[PDB]
């Protein structure tokens, strides 16, 4: 369950949120394919509650209604001509598996669902699977609203409804063979693997017994008993009773004290400087790097509502998220996500966006098409952060550099700080309040090398700075503070 199932050479999966099927699959042959990207994590396939109030926000996709193929991103058809035409061009799907619940116990009943399946929460009906109310934890459940609310008691965590979702009874087998008729359905489709949502409220044995029950990859794309990756959803900052250790027999798990702490660091607040990342990983309380999923945002907490509060980082703080982005990929700590967006109309009142619900770019509900621009970058409000040069080379710089060694770290004590990938890449950052101007031993072979931070290599051109190594290794790299992307990345592949 550990390993990605990547093409060999891929290391990074891309989350494209809110994506329709046929967008991601026009992405991976137009654009993940050829850029080197590991694959792509889809928004839940499966059907969930059409919530009107508010008009459609992004968060109705966590509330399932049935496991038909069936969604604002597209029917089975559309889903299984999406991961047939990515894995033909190397590219993985994983699916977000929303497993623990099924929607709120107050949604009114009726067929208001993306396939128009009839379900009555209030019964706990839900024929289209079928779920009864024998299906759900109302009776073990001991806390007085049914709802979880106290995160001190683990117990009450797995049992009781995250904010009155209805909370599914993982420990029954009916319910565990629908889940995995699920999954096998989506694996033999050809996915490669699953975020598993909310494994924080799933026994870890339970999980388990889901597991248990699923095919190996399809045969057609993946060797012989291959497994599907999983990386299970737990939001562990440290405290609580519940640690995402727990989960490690059953794949990796999302480490969110990585973005917390890496926008915490690259924003200078708390007395946090780029110097100390030093020994980054386990050295700062992270989970084992072999276990974990990392990623600077997330599609939750990039609203500023989640895991990581205030610090975290996103496309609307484009200069820095691609600094952290950057020291992220180049760093070989974990398996990295990198996240793409849509933009939407925030509006802050006391610190909170009220608009924080709003879906991805629609036509009166119907989700919009990802257009190209002329630049390579995305029309219709979708950002396509993984099309930012800046990020898309280092996603290249990342495969680039796999299996080598952290090494040649320079840090001038302060915002100042440079590393090396064994002799394949070098990557220089300056986040100080003055120019950093210097010669640093990069462990690369001598030659002229193209910033991928600031161009790209054509032919034997480079569209931006060139960097120059010396028969010693050593190259002098210049770093203004007042830089648009005060950050420079040169590895084998950008070689003259
Ligand atoms: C910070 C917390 O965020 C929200 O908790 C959720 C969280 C959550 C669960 C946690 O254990 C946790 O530590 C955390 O920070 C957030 O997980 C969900 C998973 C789902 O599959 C579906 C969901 O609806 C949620 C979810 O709602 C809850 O907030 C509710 O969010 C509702 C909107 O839905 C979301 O914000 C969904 C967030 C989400 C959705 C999927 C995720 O994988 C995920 O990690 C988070 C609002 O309408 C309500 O007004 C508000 O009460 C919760 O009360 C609040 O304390
Ligand atoms: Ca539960
Ligand atoms: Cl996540």
Request: proline content about 5%; some cysteine.
């Amino acid at each position: 369950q550990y390993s990605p199932n990547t093409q060999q050479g891929r290391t990074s999966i891309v989350h494209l949120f809110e994506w329709r099927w046929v967008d991601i699959a026009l992405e991976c042959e137009r654009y993940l394919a050829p850029k080197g990207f590991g694959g792509v994590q889809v928004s839940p396939p499966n059907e969930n509650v059409a919530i009107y109030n508010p008009f459609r926000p992004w968060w109705e996709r966590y509330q399932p209604v049935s496991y038909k193929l069936c969604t604002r991103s597209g029917n089975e058809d559309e889903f299984r001509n999406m991961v047939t035409r990515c894995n033909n061009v190397g590219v993985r799907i994983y699916v977000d598996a929303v497993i623990n619940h099924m929607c709120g116990n107050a949604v009114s009943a009726g067929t208001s669902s993306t396939c128009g399946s009839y379900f009555n929460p209030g019964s706990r009906d839900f024929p289209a699977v079928p779920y009864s109310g024998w299906d759900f934890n109302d009776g073990k459940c001991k806390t007085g609203s049914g709802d979880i609310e106290n995160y001190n008691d683990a117990t009450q965590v797995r049992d009781c409804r995250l904010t009155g979702l209805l909370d599914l009874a993982l420990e029954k087998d009916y319910v565990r063979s629908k889940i995995a008729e699920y999954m096998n359905h989506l694996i033999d489709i050809g996915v490669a693997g699953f975020r598993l949502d909310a494994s924080k409220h799933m026994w870890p044995g339970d999980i388990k017994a889901i597991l248990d029950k699923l095919h190996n990859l399809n045969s057609n794309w993946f060797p012989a008993g291959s497994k599907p990756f999983i990386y299970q959803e737990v939001i562990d900052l440290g405290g609580e009773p519940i640690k995402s250790s727990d989960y490690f027999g059953n794949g990796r798990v999302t480490e969110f004290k990585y973005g917390a702490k890496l926008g915490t660091v690259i924003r200078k607040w708390n007395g946090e400087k780029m110097s100390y990342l030093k020994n980054w990983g386990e050295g700062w309380g992270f989970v084992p790097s072999d276990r974990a999923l990392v990623f600077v945002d997330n599609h939750d907490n990039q609203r500023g509502h989640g895991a990581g509060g205030a610090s975290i980082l996103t496309f609307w703080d484009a200069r820095l998220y691609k600094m952290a982005v950057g020291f992220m990929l180049a760093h070989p700590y974990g398996f990295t996500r990198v996240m793409s967006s849509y933009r939407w109309p925030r509006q802050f009142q006391n610190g909170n966006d009220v608009n924080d619900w709003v879906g991805p770019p629609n036509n009166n509900g119907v989700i919009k098409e990802v257009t190209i621009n002329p630049d390579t970058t995305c029309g219709n409000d979708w950002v396509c952060e993984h099309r930012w040069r800046q990020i898309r080379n280092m996603v290249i710089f990342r495969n680039v550099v796999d299996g080598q060694p952290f090494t040649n770290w320079y840090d001038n004590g302060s915002n100042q700080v440079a590393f090396g990938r064994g002799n394949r890449g070098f990557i220089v950052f300056n986040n100080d309040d003055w120019s950093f101007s210097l010669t640093l031993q990069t462990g690369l072979p001598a030659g002229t090398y193209c910033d991928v931070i600031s161009g790209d290599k054509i032919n034997g051109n480079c569209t931006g700075i060139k960097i120059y190594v010396s028969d010693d290794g050593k190259a002098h790299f210049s770093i203004s503070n007042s830089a648009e992307d005060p950050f420079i990345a040169i590895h084998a592949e950008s070689k003259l």
